[model samples]
Target: ENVAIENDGTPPRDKESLSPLTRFLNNELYGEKDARRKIGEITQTLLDHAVESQKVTLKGEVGRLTGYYHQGAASSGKVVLFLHGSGSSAEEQASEIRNHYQKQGIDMLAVNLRGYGESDGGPSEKGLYQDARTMFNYLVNDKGIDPSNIIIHGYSMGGPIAADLARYAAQNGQAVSGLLLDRPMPSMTKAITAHEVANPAGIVGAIAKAVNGQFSVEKNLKGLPKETPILLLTDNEGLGEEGEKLRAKLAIAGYNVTGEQTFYGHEASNRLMGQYADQIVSGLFNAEQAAVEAGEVLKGLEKDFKIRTTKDFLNGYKNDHAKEIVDGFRSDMSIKQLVDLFVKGSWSAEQKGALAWEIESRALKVTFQNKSEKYNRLFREIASAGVVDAKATEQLAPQLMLSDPLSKLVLVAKQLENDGQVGVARQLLEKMYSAAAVLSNPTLYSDSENANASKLLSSLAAIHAKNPMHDTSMKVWQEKLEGKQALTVNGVVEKITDASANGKPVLLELDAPGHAMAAWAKGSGDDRVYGFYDPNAGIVEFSSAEKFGDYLTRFFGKSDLNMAQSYKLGKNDAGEAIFNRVVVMDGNTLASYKPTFGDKTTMQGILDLPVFDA
Candidate 1:
């Protein structure tokens, strides 16, 4: 040890400790062929045991199918039978395939079909297809894996072979769950063309036809069940077009098809498999679990709301049923396009106006709020289609907060009437009549050509008399008022808070526009509240007092309720709700606070009491 590397001066005897290349060089230099062969065997064994997989052999035509089987953790009897692209054997690609899918709870199996590796016969298109079929049969019949749980993932040339096997299995009444074609070729002929193999003559085509025949990838795909899901991956190098065409064909054939476009040469799709493993495994392979997860999102939307505007309903629908919406609509659709489809195809005229209102109101709430060109174009198109009033709807975008009582009333009534919401129209007309009488200026009604408040009520009453459903909607409001009369004012406040928190409806009686009943509910977030003026008709949600005043003016023709001080149903020292005068603006001055029945007053009791004079 005193000399420079003293104790280890003798050369090592064990050649097995050296790297594979070093051992191979030594054996070749020494002319030890037997030792070189032994080194290869040892290396193969070490490679096989590197990951958790078992070596297996299956009966094959040429010789036998030699491959590795990895029973992944909690694999749930699901298996991905991976077929390597042309160059690699099962041994070379097994570890990569296993490592990618095993982490996603998928079992993996890879076999070198007759040829190239430890198997018997030489590589042929027909033989490879036969080999894939044999392996699939072994998995289902011998290994007891479910046919529906088996996923065939084929890379490059292997994609065609896998497709052929899937077709054969489907014809035999055994359908695999999913198929992933990584950088797939449409056919052997296409492959020849793609590679520019200088086949000026028909010899390559003849050979391909003789070997593969009608067993092309696209042909095989056509024969498979439409219920089977197919995933395609391709690069920019000419394969993208083929992959997309195949996807289009599969989708047209009624198969659920998904695709990913990538770039990294021919092997790019294969290498990136692990990155998209979750989507591939969960979305395509394990369909039932995917459905169950999606179902949880839409579970409560059915009973969530009533009488929503077209746009409002769609917004909620998209939020609750996001996966379903994605599955239903085309992948290329914009939000505006989706809205257009829903409103034009499925909604009514009143609903369209309501949607416009919702959109404009939403735009106003944000700073310097203005609709995008997309929204403007959509609304204009809707108007052109006779779904809404072009001039009035356009005016609403700017002056939703402005305008007089009669103009606002006529506008709102027209919207409700267009939707056949006659009950709501009648209530709005009545509120407008009361609002017009109390106004300071009679000159507001001097425009003789305009449909004044009186004529509005005349038409509204005539229509209300014709519709029996109008009375039915009104009955809900009346019954709620009768129910609230039995409870105290504190009880009413507590119920509104409780019901609002739990997403249930709260019925209330308003003072001005005398005895008008409304259905109050919670909005998207806390502190935001919704009011349905006719209970079964109009939609309203406001987060601030200013917003509430604006909504009141536009819908009910009443702007007197100052949210700053009066509209609150505040609580007294005893923790019970305190409320009194429902004040309003009478002409140029603020009106006096009307007395309530003190803290003991209920919303129904307020309505039951005499109306206060303005």
Candidate 2:
């Protein structure tokens, strides 16, 4: 949330500047200028037409986010996180959306973006995602629901909301069971543009083009795993051109996409989700057994992370890096909780594939003593492309994540000072840091405040910045890795994209030296990156070097390297990349390495990188 939401606090327009119709258009089309007014009305209108059933309130970005949750009719393990569009609140959408899931015997968690319906606070891209992710963790941690069994259902404006979540999930290795975008808009811009196109803004228009950067589903669609099931349902309206265009866009990007006109119109009926309920249900497991097993796993870890909250966090949790620190501490505990459940639940061979996908989805870094060979065999079976069914690919998944998973674990206090909320954010982190230190380690994986995360990290930084216990090394690493600029996965992509486009690969020569070096590229037809342990195994008909950097970023914890070195390789027909050089400092001097000609290497080469022990 470096930029936060655009026009996040833009003042409302004066009544004298526009006519009644123009006021309506501004509220409807340009939300930033008068978002509070528009978002509040969405909730108010929802309450007007439906009964209000507030289930729970969790920490949200800058506010207390709310949701309406119900158990499955048959106790089926399957669950859906349904996000309502600007058209309705969870209350209004619950009318049909809730009923449809009920009939399918799937548990439902219907939620509102902050400032929508019962939720309190204004809206922002990251903030909305924070609200949605908070709901997701509610299911994962509190309900003990498996990530693979949870489906994300987004409607209308919720479409982009869901896509962003899906993209994060995929990037962060969170397995999402399914992604359903019904009567969707490709993006907020397009939706507004379509409306402007449909209703012609004339004197009241031209606002769509100006709002292009806001709430984009098209941008979110990138990097969605092709395996996750994606369905688009609509009755025309915004779905006409935008609907097919979205499905086509997903297809062009190598995602599995299906199209339908179940509802026929945006407001046609509530049966759209119901229409595909059976298909969704078929892919889900009984969940009853898994959920129960997960419960025990949850039970074991619950004792360690005690949830804490400040008066304000109870009121609002902003979308920023401070929150990331809190999430990072929770994650260290959270992954263990997941691993225990997975370990206990591993059944016969038939289901292990799905179980295998979960580990990869999370990109967990683990090691065992004598079980290395046995675990390696299991790894081969689970990680193998063939054993892990493509149907279970769990692509196009949405697991709302902060920048890089746990990157804020080692944070700089710098970004926090730049924002005015560091004070609030600092108090929030203090709550969690104190909570984590409660018993030298108390685990509730709960919150202590509601301010944005970056500010909290900044606050922590101020104290040497005082820290958590379950990880003494956490403090050690935090002290070592914390820097002014936290490198992000997106940063890696931007650098590589520019490199690939110009045939001039990017060179990374940083001041930090003595760290181990590793090089990798995603193999042809595969999304995972393979290592370059054997320089002769120079297979470089690469789809991307983006994953190469991610490989370095994610495994930084597992490796001994304090600093990482990676090179960018571009797929140019002219072979001009050979001249592009990469450098690392040898103490005070520069050491350089060049790419070897593309060659053949075993997949095992990846596990052989210095970061991994053979």
Candidate 3:
């Protein structure tokens, strides 16, 4: 059945401009002047022209990461490091969760991973993990941020990255308060396998065997840190019983659990969340304050309604990660105190009853290892220490990001600087740097104080200056393997147009390389490129090469080398691609690309092609 919705033909002229949050997104999707200008006007109207924005760069392990800052109004000293879904930049989350939380005083640092949108450089062959370490390092080590006060929030693939980063911190003995996976999958391997196995039979597996460059997401799961608090919320889409199964697996592996399967799909229901935003906010604050008052600072949040025991979440905690939180809580609050609060202190009617509608626990629980008093003290000490750097971390900036019709002028300037287009870069800095300063925030990602964008551009310029490489490598290879032949026409069929109409092939001689074509043409230079004895079909016989350079160029350029090199061939439910990087040049321009190739084609092959400028 085809589902159809009503379409209003008239555009909403009364609609205001996009907000600062959406402005950054427009910059990523549409870089053209007119589109950006439209975006700017829309932004000015929606943001009410009041915003704190920043333009700067971050020095990562491989390159300078350039991006914008859109600070939220929240000041909870709780920063959510948000990772957007695949194919989208940081702009994707500004409205969804960022602005929503910031309004409630929570800070957010959303990032545009390397490649895609206004982000620097090309995509990582290893996928998102390529930059996970850099982001984690920046948040924890360089920024001196507290692990426990930070919540890693990720959408789609970003969820795995968030979890992986939390795991990274935990392994290094850094504390992480919570890991929130918003409609996420456990690992790439399982996800891919599920898709391939969607239908039945082993066709997907068989197809996968023939492709190259394909890597599994599940294979990378081994690197995840196990001891961090994890809150996984799934919807009824790709996330089904399969997601629960994966949760069980992750539980055994080690993760504090708050697993919820929402009736809604992966996407958050804006109407629902918005309608209940106040109630939701109240609950979260209640949970946090409740834990603190109970002298259970590190137990995460508690549910007063119906006693949500640890066993209720993730099948008995599956491992010690949850057990530690539960046992720690019981010890800190003391069983006697909890009982007193429940029995005598209006807890049963107010606090505990509120948990049902307020807390909405699906599989929320805690576990206890039952350690000594000394161990508990030590645990509290470490957990308390985790809050040390929570306040000092950077906030988002929105002004410089949304101010003018030409905000992207700075973006382009930074891009040039990173590309070694220095004179332009310096000029851009000289002109707009001051205006940018007005919107700067030291607590932001790319503050002028941090000199992030300048640093990034300078470094990029230096690298490009030294080597001067772009997509040329891929181009050179692609050209060598995919150039077309200058075909020679045979004789025509003359003016005969009735039931049958055909043109005769032009008879042409080959200026042969005198190799393969020469052999086929019987060493005759006068032989046509194609013989057309049958005018109805207009089929032509083979001939020698017309131009030596042209033929060699065509032969080399027409090869499938780049396609052969770049793609990862794997089959799931989707059929496998035969060639990945099938780069085709249209006149002087490049054709559009399909994100997922049908068969053998892969992103790596495209990356390897000089066309991608990687």
State every prediction's TM-score relative to the real structure.
Answer: 0.41, 0.41, 0.38
Residue 44 shift from truth in candidate 3, angstroms:
9.7
- Kindly give the stretch of ten consecutive residues in candidate 3 with the minimal lDDT sum: 490-499
**lDDT: which candidate is best?**
1
How well is each residue in 1-614 modelled by candidate 2, as lDDT tens digits? Answer: 21222111222222222666555554574243333324354544653543422365666556665656766555255788887777445666665667677766677887667656556665556677777777776666666766567878877767788887877776766668778776776766677766654556654245665566677776777678655667666554545445654553454333555444443557654555546666555433345335545754453353243101223321222222222332222323344554554455444442333332232223211110011122122222333433332311111111111011111211222122222223221222223222222211112112322122223222222221122212232222111211323334334334434434332222222112222122222212333222211111111112334433433333232232212233332222332222122221121110111111142221112111121011
lDDT (Cα, tens digit) per residue for candidate 1, span 1-614: 01111011222112122577544433322224332122244437666564654666667655566666776765355788888655555665555556777666677877766653455555555677877877786687667775467888877777887888778877888778788887777775566545655444565445444444333677777668655777877655655445544554453233555655555466554467656777677656544545744643332221122133233432332111332433234323433443444445555444343333223222221111122333233323433443333121111111122111222222233333333333332333223323222121222222331223323322322232222113332221223222224333333334444533443333343332212233233333343343333221223333332333333433322233223132344434554322332211111110111122133322112122221111
Say which candidate scores most in TM-score. 2
Instruction: Rate residue 64 of model 1 by lDDT.
Output: 62
27: Cα error in model 1, Å? 30
Given candidate 2, what's the lDDT at residue 190? 72
lDDT of 1: 0.45
The clash count of every prediction, one per candidate, is 0, 37, 78
Candidate 3 per-residue C-alpha lDDT over 150-188 given as tens digits, one digit per residue, 9 for 90 to 100:
666755667767766666666667656666766675554
Q: Each candidate: RMSD to true structure?
A: 27.0, 23.9, 30.5
TM-score of 2: 0.41
TM-score of 3: 0.38
Q: In candidate 2, which residue ranges exceed 4 Å CA deviation?
A: 1-26, 29-54, 198-205, 283-614
